[PDB]
Design a protein around this ligand. Structure first.
Ligand SMILES: CCCCCCCCCCCCCC(=O)O
Ligand SMILES: CCCCCCCCCCCCCC(=O)O
Ligand SMILES: [Cl-]
Ligand SMILES: [Cl-]
Ligand SMILES: [Cl-]
Ligand SMILES: [Cl-]
Ligand SMILES: [Cl-]
Ligand SMILES: [Cl-]
Ligand SMILES: [Cl-]
Ligand SMILES: [Cl-]
Ligand SMILES: [Cl-]
Ligand SMILES: [Cl-]
Ligand SMILES: [Cl-]
Ligand SMILES: [Cl-]
Ligand SMILES: [Cl-]
Ligand code: NA
Ligand code: NA
Ligand code: NA
Lengths: 173, 69, 182, 69
């Protein structure tokens, strides 16, 4: 586990058609102040009557203070997020895939969600939500360790050659 | 009350495409009505603006497979 | 001679064994005279900063070295603040002539958020020949970047959960705004 | 052919103390001889210079247990 995996489940006490409509109208809302920008950057209806959309959000970068001090070059930049979706009215399902496309060296959060008719109540909507949190910094830590070990081993050779040099010089004054 | 587009010049085109798209979505699409897209012209007008704004801001959205890989 | 290394827990552990074909007393004397030598151009500065003899006739010393900071370029870009600084290294030692052993413990005291290398070495009379000296060398290579990686990941997960709550409350706000008009 | 001290003004003092110590180490200490130390006043003068230089350069050597224990 360098990648953290999340699995979640939610119920919206509204019907699937209301939820699917609300999906496109939910911004702005009182809980979305961190969402600054919203655009559709691609949209088509497929032959099997599926709606394919790609939505671009810009969001505020809000980092704990310690990460601001460690990652100064990231503090100034907003987060850009793509949300791909497939809306399928024939099966009353919607599938979404959301991930940040910048700050990607620092961390990537990917979310895959499925919206469907609540199995207990046909008037409600369940959401099954999967997420993966990854950071290329684990690979950087390993590269730094491997460099440290390589330099240490090289310096051991220099240490011993240096010892042999001075002992030969001292043996006979 | 409404969101801004990522391009300021595109916001009012966005507000008008979204508003049209929502009417078509609830009344035709979700109801299975297969008559073609109503808001087509509003969309590529809107697109033309935002796509330029995206390149201008260097938002790196190109070459990204749909729904991930 | 031989050596090996492997992980400990995101710590890399090294164990090495070598021999000097010189007697223990010559090696212990040479320890103090080995700088400078043709293989030590990266060692810029050398000082004793503590030294005493114990009641049991052991020599306790602390030697401070300044060493050149030579990082690969990818690491310079990642760690711009580390490039201008040499490495400061402390070497603690116990010389025990009654038992013909010397023990050293060497580690960097700066650059310590980026990595720490700790080396523990024991010099003793070689078991096979009285005129040789053997060295048992252990080392630990660690980096606080692993703990940083985990902390970044934990803040990403926490913020994600918080956004899920906001997403759901947002849905509930707009559903109620939509179900109040028709 | 001799090492520099981290303190620029200290290097000759370091060099004079080191070779006094080398002689005492090899000829007395390593042979179990307990004639104290003949280099203490070289050492005290040398430490005064170098401990000063370590503070001015803010080298962080304080508070560090011996042999990392
Ligand atoms: C310091 C910022 C780096 C990472 C930004 C994380 C943004 C999350 C992208 C995936 C969002 C899933 C949807 C959601 O949060 O509700
Ligand atoms: C980028 C600087 C990171 C830390 C520097 C490593 C210094 C090594 C300290 C331990 C030295 C043991 C002796 C040796 O390496 O030969
Ligand atoms: Cl605020
Ligand atoms: Cl976010
Ligand atoms: Cl940075
Ligand atoms: Cl239907
Ligand atoms: Cl970025
Ligand atoms: Cl890397
Ligand atoms: Cl190297
Ligand atoms: Cl026109
Ligand atoms: Cl020395
Ligand atoms: Cl960093
Ligand atoms: Cl930095
Ligand atoms: Cl440092
Ligand atoms: Cl931390
Ligand atoms: Na506010
Ligand atoms: Na950057
Ligand atoms: Na149907």
């Amino acid at each position: 586990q360098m990648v953290k995996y999340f699995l979640g489940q939610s119920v919206l006490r509204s019907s699937w058609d209301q939820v699917f409509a609300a999906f496109w109208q939910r911004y702005p809302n009182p809980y979305s102040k961190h969402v600054l920008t919203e655009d559709i950057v691609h949209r088509e209806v497929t032959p099997d009557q599926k709606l394919l959309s790609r939505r671009l959000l810009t969001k505020t970068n809000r980092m704990p203070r310690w990460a601001e001090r460690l990652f100064p070059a990231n503090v100034a930049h907003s987060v850009y997020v793509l949300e791909d979706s497939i809306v399928d009215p024939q099966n009353q399902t919607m599938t979404t895939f959301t991930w940040n496309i910048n700050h990607a060296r620092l961390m990537v959060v990917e979310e895959r969600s499925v919206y469907s008719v609540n199995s207990d109540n046909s008037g409600w909507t369940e959401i099954r939500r999967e997420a993966w949190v990854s950071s290329s910094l684990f690979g950087v830590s390993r590269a730094v360790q491997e460099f440290g070990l390589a330099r240490f081993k090289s310096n051991v050779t220099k240490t011993m050659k240096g010892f042999e040099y001075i002992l030969a010089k001292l043996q006979g004054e | 009350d409404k969101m801004n587009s990522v391009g300021e010049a595109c916001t009012d085109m966005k507000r008008e495409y979204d508003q049209c798209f929502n009417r078509w979505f609830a009344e035709k699409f979700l109801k299975g009505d297969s008559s073609g897209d109503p808001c087509t012209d509003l969309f590529k007008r809107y697109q033309q603006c935002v796509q330029k704004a995206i390149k201008e801001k260097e938002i790196p959205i190109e070459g990204l497979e749909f729904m991930g890989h």
